Ligand binder design. Structure first.
Ligand SMILES: [Zn+2]
Ligand SMILES: [Zn+2]
Ligand SMILES: [Zn+2]
Lengths: 230, 47, 59, 83, 608, 201, 229, 105, 172, 284
RNA sequence: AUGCGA
């Protein structure tokens, strides 16, 4: 029952919404592979410009509304580039503009990596024929819009097979029994329930060994040498 | 446990809204996913 | 003649019928017959003209 | 259920699934003697003919995109960017 | 299927609900009464299991439809169960509801206003008003009848307010409110409801001491004695087996006296049907009779195997008729026979008979509810490992399909599949004939079914089928000049003829391997008829997507019959749409073995 | 309750009107115009004659034909209206829209049309031109369209035979031309529509 | 009735023959290949009921099977490990013999008769013959009897001592198998030849005694004071 | 197309007034009557029918058992898989039902 | 490939008021082209080519007053190897109601047939390569079988390599 | 002994013993006596509930049953009066079957022009030899009836009136109408009638007709029928002939000395020579 | 089910 609504939200065939975006970005795995290989795409810039020629499409939508959000939020977000003290005044652009309609509505993680690439490639920008970060960035955004997951894609099933099929190739429970222990039974009784504890930078290794002994359970049996009942 | 779900369904007087892809298969209905996520109509000349 | 491709699934009136006068009947007949003449239905049309003649007085 | 034209908010592009269904249904129509609005240009496969009709957007079909509420947007082929 | 035969009455939803014996009697095509099945070793017993009212048989027409075995859809008869019994399917339920009553008042032993409390919650959850469902608990105040009625007033007012708001706000509708969370809140509520229902170990509304109820498991309920402290307390308030009949007579009255709450207790959504909640819902006063069409014996090649239903049903008729005959024997004793304890034994026959019939009907439902490897009942028919649903609904056999061991072929496209001419001559496409395909179909007809781009059959536009299986070149020649004939019936003037043409180099086909581990393992390939082949030819590039190897692996070839499925098999399922896996998006399709060593050798700087 | 179900039988099986004799000298106004809603299929081949498509498809075979629901022989149709599948066209648009099946190229539509129906009832007094005269019935033809026959059993013994000979009326003169009769029944279980007249009421 | 049971393989009786299943006992000789025909008669099954088991320790090839079950003749699929195959040199005892004379020789060898022994424990070796407990000795006498027994086995002068007797010696072992000298001569023993070096002649060994026996695999690997065969 | 259209696809009768696919029957024809689809729930016993408090003309249909009925002429045909019909076999025994929806009702 | 058949005339053996079915004819009206396959005793000529649809025997039941035949229902043609008349273990049965017919189905090596070395390196025959197109050695021969080397790196069927070099030496 | 068995059980298993004991608990006293009285009242309720169905079997045998037969006269004091001619040949048709011309006609060919049916059967040759007196007119009428039934049986595969008519010799319409109405399942209808009268004879009707035929032979043979020769003559299954004769209630067994002598069959084959007979005390 | 191809 789990599929993509036309609004990009993940709803069940019941109608119950499960996620508001696929992985929170609505990106298709079958597209992503090169979606973050910017330099290569650039070496084949003119070809991709021939695929995603914008002049056919630049007439049907807006390339600024999201870019405007990018200006106010990109400023304040670079101002807030501590985690729980978030830029709560600005949700990500994917919340504020249909990624299919205003080119530039992209995960902030992808936006940031892309800009940082454009800055780190000013020397590639000293190797181009004339390409600029607005023309290349515009192209890569258009790759992003054209890489989005289609309305109605059976992504629930796709997920499920993507977990089953590779699990055929298969101190704590690993592999299939572990996945079973989670996915299949949601067992409140792990076979090897563990809790990882970060120890402060100041915590010496010897203090840590003292604490390791100091926390472990100690049964009376553990100290008993001999019991004689007469 | 098909019969168990049968019992709880009848006792509820449940109505199937025919959403499950499987359930819809049971009734021989175009699946609602993908190409069945929508309907197609036709534009016809009125004059 | 047994299925949808020839016969409507369902027919329902939305109000109580209206009792067309002889003159309204004749005006409909003349307009309908003329529009149809302008196909075994023609034979029923042949009967409609006789009805028209009977709605004229005499076949 | 009628989503106002002023209010249509969905992807201007034809989904792969929408395009697929359109091509099937229109092909099926021509194959059931729907009047072809494009040059047959020799072709005999109704499916490739419907593909020609898509290339010219001569297709006279409309997509009803449903929203899980049940509201829908009636879109012409002649506007949704085919690809 | 034919595209030429549309329907426009599609099912939009499915309501579930209990039948009723009077409904069955009105619809029932017949009552089957005779425990005989066949007679004189070979004849269909009148008004028995194989009465023609239950469908057509042996060239005998359906006595309810007069239709042949190949035509009569069949009709469902019915059995009038002597005494009322217990429905296995709800037996746990009726036991629960039995434990909830008062035996001197015949109400639920739970506080009436608290009950009303429940009814309120279940009404709000018909509309799924969850926040209000939690908000009801706040209504608060020896407790006067004026005060208990004041709680009933505030609660009813609360119902009216939450409804008036939600209906005003359109936050629900006349049709109720239905969501997954509403269902869950119902299961939790109905559970806490049942726990409070169980808490009363004596009546509160009436103070009465209900007996402890014991059960055998599926055929008897017993009514336990009480303690003299409770008995004498009953004086101031002034284990035995009981039949289903007494259970029905008590529970009916209890179920009516608490109909006002139970009305909302037994529906998760608004009872638009104004359905009375009847105790006869858990009991079977009658038994239906399925169509014989669906009760035919399994004859596989020579062996005729009896139907298991015939056997269990004959067991029901024998037991029931014996019990009716015992009822005749007491109707004999019953003049008066003042001291003939002789019946003290036929009365043992009555008790034994009664448990017997109940258990045997149970057996008719579920073998695992009766008392070595007995014929399966409907519960066994529906589940085990397939559940009629899994074995014939969630998966089926299919037509237009072939299976064969695959053989490699590198010279075909990577998107094609090599079809051997046996399969190329035995698979057809239902081609509507036009002015644009008249030439091709006229030639295919000329070839006939036993040649290349040929055709096995011709379906007229009148609906009739004309097989070309044995027609001569002359006969096919005559039909070729008739493929484009004019209309004949205005009933059919809109259609055009169809030709069941062989599969050819322009068709798409859906190849599926064994372990359907992922959707990428079942793709559509473009058909390429290969001469002088007998095995499915496949390009190597696909074998790492099927996880296939020519060791002996066999593949299913599906030929879709429809432009919707053709367009999907040429555009979506097609190999080109499968260059990446959705698991990871790494390409799963590339050259293999020898081609790899060939690239390593050819691309060496040493290669001139 | 048992009167909801009797309300179902009388109120569902109720008859609307009893078409009277015009001026009590004509015929019963069994001809009536009724606006309906029908549900028809549309082939693709009528994409250039869609209103006429529906006509040729469904409405043309319906004329001169009995409909159980309307209770009579369709006298003609008026005002076909395709219900647009998509709102706003003060019903008016150079093109309409229709739902296509999710399996076939066929369309399904709502339609609103006025019907011209011949809705006779039992007891109506009608006049007919004698079709035939056999010793068990009198054949007549209503409007030159509807065949009517009055069988011997429903005829007054006061009628007079003259020999398949000839009938002489109750007055004592042989019948000729037109006959005035009351409708006893209308039969429709076969080939074409049907009827039944009486001379005793 | 035996044609029916033998035609279905559903052997059923009021005692159940002390067997875990009522099917699968019969197989079609399936002569599609002479290899298959001979393969049928050296195939042995662990039984259907262990085929039903979910685990694999039953399927695990154990080293005890050396010389008795084939390490490579095993089907692939559900039966894997369930359908074992006998070694081409394996034999099956079909009779029992001269067990009556073995007590006499043991008594001569120093076994105390169980009425006289009056002792029992892991601290002492129990000499048993076919599940007839005949006596107790020191564990040292356990070893002396085992080896001298093998000498009188390979010898030809003690007819009360059939060549095919299996000499189960169990030495004393910390938490080991409970000690004893369990001889067996009865039916269904699996027996296989090995070459006894001290008398340079063939000797029949079964899988029980093999556990504690040092059998060199070839003459050049015979380790001093270790491999007896 | 695969799990239906090419397997057990059947255009089957359902009662537009009952919503069931197993009460449906072909009514028996007569000297003046063709075969007509009837729903068993939607018919009246010719022995009753208010006859004491009470005809359309065309609501009487006859069974192969010669039984006259009033009504039952409101059922139609819909595309489903034949196994669906197989379900009433078990389910109708199971004391449940289909309310097979359609257009207006 | 041999397929053996039992042709029984005692399907219902039935009470025992009759048991007359006899191989042969009576009405003459049968298609005399059946003699092209079935001898005047109702049994096919041993050696006969049989194809799907061909009559495998002809018999006569007095109840039907008809000469009936058992049709052959198979995917492939065969040849009749033996026809065996069974009167044995019977009390009288002289009417010859049981006949066993053996079919000989020739099986040519064909694309899709499985082949294996003695090393479990199994493969279907992908194609029957033209002799001219095969590779020919300087000894003037072209191999019988070609196995792809790329199978070995996973299988490590090196015993097969030694069998190749041993069979070559041992032939020479 | 069961109790003792229980003791054995007690020793063997605590748990299993518990289960059996539970069974005992389930039984309890079973019929309680006070409970029994209440139950009796319930039985009265059952009386109302009870499916007052009928005699079950007597009614079925009397009425339509495994195969229909002519109406037997259970009170007949002579076998010939069990199935009178009017039961074999309906009164309405019997009054119209006048065979006087057949008795008076000496020429076999002219008699053939008088027969309602002509076929390949030897029956007419067999019965004709014995019908020489006018007193046998009734017997001759029965001969007429077999001929008519034979025409029906051999053409039971005919599915329309005209094709059936093609096999008969201008038989009285009343005979065809009666046979089709009560011994066949007519597909009724004026729609079919405008083209022709179409119909079919189902297997149960075929069984009925065959029973009527055996009834005819039985009457003309004074209720003593040779099984073997009849089966051979009619091309019927031995099991079918036996079953059908038993439906009529005849006793079929090996010939008596008198029967063997009269029929001229070896006494040694008498036990294998099946004869059908009818007696005074009617069959149950 | 026994066995088996993958
Ligand atoms: Zn039927
Ligand atoms: Zn109470
Ligand atoms: Zn209904």
């Amino acid at each position: 029952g789990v599929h993509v609504s036309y609004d990009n939200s993940i709803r069940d065939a019941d109608g119950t919404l499960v996620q508001f975006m696929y992985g929170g970005d609505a990106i298709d795995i079958t597209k992503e592979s090169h979606m973050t290989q910017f330099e290569f795409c650039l070496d084949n810039y003119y070809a991709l410009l021939k695929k995603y020629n914008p002049s056919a499409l630049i007439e049907h939508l807006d390339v600024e509304s999201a870019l405007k959000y990018s200006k106010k939020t990109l400023k304040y977000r670079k101002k807030h580039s501590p985690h729980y003290k978030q830029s709560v005044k600005y949700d990500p652009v994917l919340a504020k503009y249909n990624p299919a309609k205003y080119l530039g509505s992209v995960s902030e993680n992808f936006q940031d990596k892309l800009e940082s690439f454009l800055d780190k490639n000013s020397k590639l920008f000293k190797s181009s024929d004339g390409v600029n970060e607005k023309k290349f960035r515009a192209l890569m955004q258009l790759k992003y819009m054209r890489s989005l997951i289609n309305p109605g894609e059976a992504v629930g099933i796709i997920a499920s097979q993507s977990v089953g099929e590779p699990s055929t190739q298969m101190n704590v429970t690993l592999g299939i029994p572990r996945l079973r222990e989670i996915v299949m039974t949601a067992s409140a009784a792990i076979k090897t329930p563990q809790m990882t504890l970060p120890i402060w930078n100041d915590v010496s290794d010897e203090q840590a060994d003292t604490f390791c002994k100091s926390i472990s359970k100690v049964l009376l049996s553990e100290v008993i040498d001999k019991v004689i009942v007469t | 446990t098909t019969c168990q779900f049968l019992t709880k369904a009848v006792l509820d007087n449940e109505r199937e809204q025919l959403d499950s892809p499987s359930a819809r298969i049971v009734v021989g209905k175009l699946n609602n996913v993908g190409t069945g996520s929508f309907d197609v109509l036709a534009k016809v000349p009125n004059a | 003649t047994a299925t949808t491709l020839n016969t409507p699934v369902v027919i329902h009136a939305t109000q109580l019928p209206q009792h067309v006068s002889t003159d309204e009947v004749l005006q409909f007949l003349e307009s309908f017959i003329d529009e149809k003449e302008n196909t075994n239905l023609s034979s029923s049309i042949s009967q409609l003209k006789r009805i028209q003649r009977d709605f004229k007085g005499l076949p | 259920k009628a989503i106002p034209k002023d209010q249509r908010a969905t992807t201007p592009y034809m989904t792969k699934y929408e395009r697929a269904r359109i091509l099937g249904t229109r092909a099926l129509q021509i194959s059931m003697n729907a009047p072809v609005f494009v040059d047959l240009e020799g072709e005999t496969d109704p499916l490739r003919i419907a593909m020609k009709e898509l290339a010219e957007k001569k297709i006279p079909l409309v997509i009803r995109r449903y929203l899980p509420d049940g509201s829908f947007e009636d879109w012409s082929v002649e506007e949704l960017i085919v690809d | 299927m034919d595209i030429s035969k549309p329907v426009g009455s599609e099912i939009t939803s499915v309501d579930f609900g209990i039948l009723t014996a009077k409904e069955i009697r009105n619809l029932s095509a017949k009552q089957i009464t005779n425990p005989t099945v066949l007679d004189n070793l070979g004849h269909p017993v009148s008004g028995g299991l194989y009465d023609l009212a239950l469908g057509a048989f042996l060239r005998n027409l359906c006595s309810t439809c007069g239709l042949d075995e190949k035509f009569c859809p069949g009709h469902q008869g019915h059995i009038e169960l002597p005494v009322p019994c217990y429905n296995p399917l709800f037996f746990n339920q009726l036991y629960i509801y039995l434990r909830a009553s008062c035996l001197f008042c015949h109400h639920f032993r739970l506080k009436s206003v608290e009950v009303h409390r429940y009814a309120c919650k279940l009404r709000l959850l018909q509309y799924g008003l969850i926040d209000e469902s939690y908000k009801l608990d706040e209504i608060t105040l020896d407790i006067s009848s004026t005060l208990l009625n004041e709680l009933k007033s505030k609660r009813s007012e609360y119902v009216d307010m939450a409804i008036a708001k939600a209906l005003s706000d359109g936050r629900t509708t006349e049709r109720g409110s239905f969501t997954a969370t509403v269902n869950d809140e119902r299961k939790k509520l109905v559970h806490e409801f049942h726990k409070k229902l169980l808490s009363r170990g004596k009546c509160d509304n009436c103070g009465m001491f209900s007996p402890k109820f014991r059960k055998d498991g599926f055929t008897k309920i017993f009514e336990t004695a009480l303690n003299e402290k409770q008995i004498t307390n009953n004086r101031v308030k002034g284990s035995t087996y009981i039949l289903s009949t007494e259970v029905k007579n008590i529970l009916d009255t209890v179920f009516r006296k608490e109909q006002c709450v139970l009305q909302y207790v037994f529906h998760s959504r608004p009872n638009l049907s104004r359905k009375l909640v009847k105790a006869d819902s858990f009991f079977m006063d009658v038994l239906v009779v399925p169509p014989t069409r669906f009760r035919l014996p399994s004859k596989l090649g020579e062996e005729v195997h009896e139907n298991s239903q015939n056997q269990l049903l004959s067991k029901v008729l024998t037991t029931s008729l014996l019990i009716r005959d015992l009822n005749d024997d007491l109707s004999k004793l019953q003049k008066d026979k003042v001291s003939l304890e002789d019946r003290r034994v036929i009365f043992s026959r009555l008790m034994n008979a009664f448990v017997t019939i109940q258990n045997d009907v149970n057996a008719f439902i579920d073998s695992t509810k009766a008392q070595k490897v007995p014929i399966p009942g409907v519960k066994q028919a529906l589940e085990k490992k397939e559940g009629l649903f899994r074995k014939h609904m969630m998966g089926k056999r299919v037509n237009y399909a072939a299976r064969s061991v695959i053989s490699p072929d590198p010279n075909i496209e990577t998107n094609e599949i090599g079809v051997p001419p046996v399969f190329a001559v035995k698979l057809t496409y239902p081609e509507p004939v036009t002015a644009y395909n008249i030439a091709e179909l006229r030639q295919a007809v000329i070839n006939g079914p036993d040649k290349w781009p040929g055709a096995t059959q011709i379906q007229n536009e009148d609906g009739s089928l004309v097989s070309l299986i044995g027609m001569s070149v002359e006969q096919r020649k005559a039909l070729a000049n008739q493929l484009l004939t004019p209309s004949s019936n205005v009933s059919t003037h809109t259609l055009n003829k169809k030709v069941y043409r062989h599969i050819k180099n322009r068709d798409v086909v859906l190849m599926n391997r064994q372990p359907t581990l992922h959707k990428a393992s079942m793709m559509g390939h473009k058909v390429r008829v290969l001469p002088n082949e007998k095995t499915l030819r496949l390009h190597y590039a696909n074998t790492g997507a099927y996880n296939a190897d020519f060791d002996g692996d066999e593949m299913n070839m599906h030929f879709p019959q429809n432009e919707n499925a053709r367009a999907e098999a040429l555009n979506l399922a097609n190999t080109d749409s499968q260059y990446l896996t959705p698991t990871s998006g790494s390409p799963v399709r590339g050259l293999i073995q020898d081609h790899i060593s060939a690239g390593v050798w050819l691309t060496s700087k040493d290669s001139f | 309750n048992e009167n909801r179900e009797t309300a179902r039988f009388i109120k569902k099986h109720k008859k609307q009107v009893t078409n009277p004799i015009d001026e009590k000298n004509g015929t019963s106004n069994c001809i009536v115009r009724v606006p309906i809603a029908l549900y028809v299929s549309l082939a693709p081949m009528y994409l250039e004659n869609p209103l006429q498509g529906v006509m040729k498809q469904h409405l043309n075979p319906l004329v001169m034909k009995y409909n159980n629901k309307v209770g009579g022989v369709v006298l003609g149709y008026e005002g076909l209206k395709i219900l647009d599948a998509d709102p706003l066209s003060k019903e008016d648009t150079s093109e309409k829209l229709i739902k296509i099946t999710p399996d076939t190229p066929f369309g399904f539509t709502w339609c609103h049309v006025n019907l011209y129906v011949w809705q006779p009832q039992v007891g109506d007094v009608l006049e007919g031109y004698i079709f035939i005269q056999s010793a068990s019935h009198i054949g007549l033809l209503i409007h030159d369209a509807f065949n009517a026959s009055i069988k011997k059993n429903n005829i007054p013994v006061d009628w007079t035979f003259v020999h398949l000979g000839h009938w002489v009326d109750s007055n004592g003169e042989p019948i000729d031309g037109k006959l005035r009769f009351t409708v006893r029944n209308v039969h429709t279980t076969g080939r074409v529509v049907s009827v039944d007249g009486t001379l005793i009421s | 009735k035996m044609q029916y049971f033998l035609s279905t393989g559903n052997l059923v009786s009021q005692s159940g023959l002390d067997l875990q299943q009522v099917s699968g006992y019969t197989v079609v000789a399936e002569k599609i290949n002479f290899y298959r025909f001979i393969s049928h008669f050296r195939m042995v099954h662990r039984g259907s009921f262990f085929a039903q088991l979910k685990t694999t320790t039953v399927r695990k090839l154990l080293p005890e099977s050396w010389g008795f079950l084939c390490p490579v003749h095993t089907p692939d699929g559900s039966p894997c490990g369930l359908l074992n195959h006998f070694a081409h040199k394996c034999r099956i005892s079909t009779q029992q013999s001269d067990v009556s004379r073995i007590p006499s020789i043991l008594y001569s060898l120093g076994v105390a008769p169980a009425s006289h022994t009056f002792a029992a424990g892991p601290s002492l070796c129990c000499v048993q013959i076919d599940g007839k407990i005949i006596g107790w000795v020191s564990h040292e006498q356990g070893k002396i009897i085992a080896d001298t027994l093998r000498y009188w086995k390979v010898e030809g002068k003690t007819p009360g001592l059939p060549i095919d007797l299996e000499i189960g010696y169990v030495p004393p072992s910390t938490r080991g198998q409970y000690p004893g000298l369990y001889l067996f001569g009865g039916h269904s023993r699996m027996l296989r030849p090995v070459r006894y070096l001290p008398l340079d002649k063939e000797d029949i060994v079964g899988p029980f005694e093999q556990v504690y026996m040092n059998i060199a695999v070839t003459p050049q690997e015979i380790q001093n004071n270790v491999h007896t065969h | 197309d695969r799990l239906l259209n090419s397997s057990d696809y059947t255009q089957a009768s359902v009662c537009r007034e009952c919503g069931s696919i197993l009460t449906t029957q072909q009514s028996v024809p007569r000297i003046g009557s063709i075969s007509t689809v009837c729903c068993r729930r939607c018919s009246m016993r010719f022995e009753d029918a208010k006859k004491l408090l009470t005809e359309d003309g065309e609501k009487i249909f006859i069974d192969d058992s010669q039984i006259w009925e009033d009504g039952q002429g409101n059922k139609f045909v819909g595309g489903n898989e034949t196994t669906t019909v197989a379900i009433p076999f078990v389910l109708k025994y199971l004391d449940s039902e289909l309310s097979a929806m359609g257009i207006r009702l | 490939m041999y397929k053996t058949e039992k042709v029984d005339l005692a399907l219902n053996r039935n009470r025992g008021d009759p048991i007359t079915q006899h191989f042969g004819f009576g009405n003459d009206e049968w298609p005399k082209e059946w003699l092209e396959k079935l001898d005047e005793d109702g049994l096919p000529y041993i050696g006969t080519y049989v194809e799907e649809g061909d009559p495998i025997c002809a018999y006569f039941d007095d109840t039907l007053n008809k000469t009936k035949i058992k049709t052959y229902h198979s995917s492939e043609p065969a040849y009749i190897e033996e026809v065996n008349l069974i009167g044995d273990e019977s009390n009288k049965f002289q009417e010859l109601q049981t006949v066993s017919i053996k079919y000989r189905i020739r099986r040519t090596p064909q694309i899709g047939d499985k082949f294996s070395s003695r090393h479990g390196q199994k493969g279907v025959c992908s194609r029957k390569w033209p002799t001219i197109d095969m590779p020919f050695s300087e000894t003037g021969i072209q191999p019988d079988i070609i196995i792809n080397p790329h199978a070995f790196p996973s299988r490590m069927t090196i015993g097969m390599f030694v069998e190749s070099l041993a069979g070559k030496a041992g032939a020479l | 002994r069961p109790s003792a068995l229980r003791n054995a059980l007690g020793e063997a298993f605590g748990t299993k013993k518990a289960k059996k004991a539970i069974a005992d608990l389930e039984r309890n006293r079973i019929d309680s006596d006070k409970l029994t009285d209440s139950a009796i009242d319930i039985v009265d309720s059952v009386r109302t509930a009870s499916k007052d169905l009928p005699t079950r079997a007597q009614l079925d045998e009397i009425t339509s049953n495994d195969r229909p037969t002519p109406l037997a006269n259970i009170d007949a004091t002579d076998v010939e009066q069990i199935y009178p001619i009017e039961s074999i040949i309906p009164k309405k048709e019997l009054q119209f079957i006048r065979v006087s011309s057949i008795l008076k006609e000496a020429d076999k060919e002219k008699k053939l022009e008088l027969f309602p049916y002509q076929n390949n059967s030897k029956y007419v040759a067999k019965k004709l030899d014995s019908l020489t007196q006018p007193s046998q007119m009734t017997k001759l009428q029965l001969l007429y009836y077999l001929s008519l039934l034979l025409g029906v049986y051999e053409n039971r595969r005919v599915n329309n009136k005209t094709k059936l008519l093609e096999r008969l010799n201008s038989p009285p319409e009343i005979l065809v109408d009666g046979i089709l109405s009560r011994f066949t399942v007519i597909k009724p209808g004026q729609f079919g009638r405008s083209k022709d009268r179409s119909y079919f004879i189902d297997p149960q009707n075929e069984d009925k007709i065959l029973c009527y035929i055996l009834a005819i032979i039985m009457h003309l043979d004074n209720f003593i029928v040779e099984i073997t020769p009849l089966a051979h003559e009619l091309n019927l299954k031995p099991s079918k002939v036996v079953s059908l004769f038993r439906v009529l209630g005849a006793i079929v067994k090996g010939a008596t000395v008198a029967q063997a002598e009269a029929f001229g069959i070896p006494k040694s084959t008498a036990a294998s020579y099946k004869i059908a007979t009818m007696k005074v005390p009617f069959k149950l």
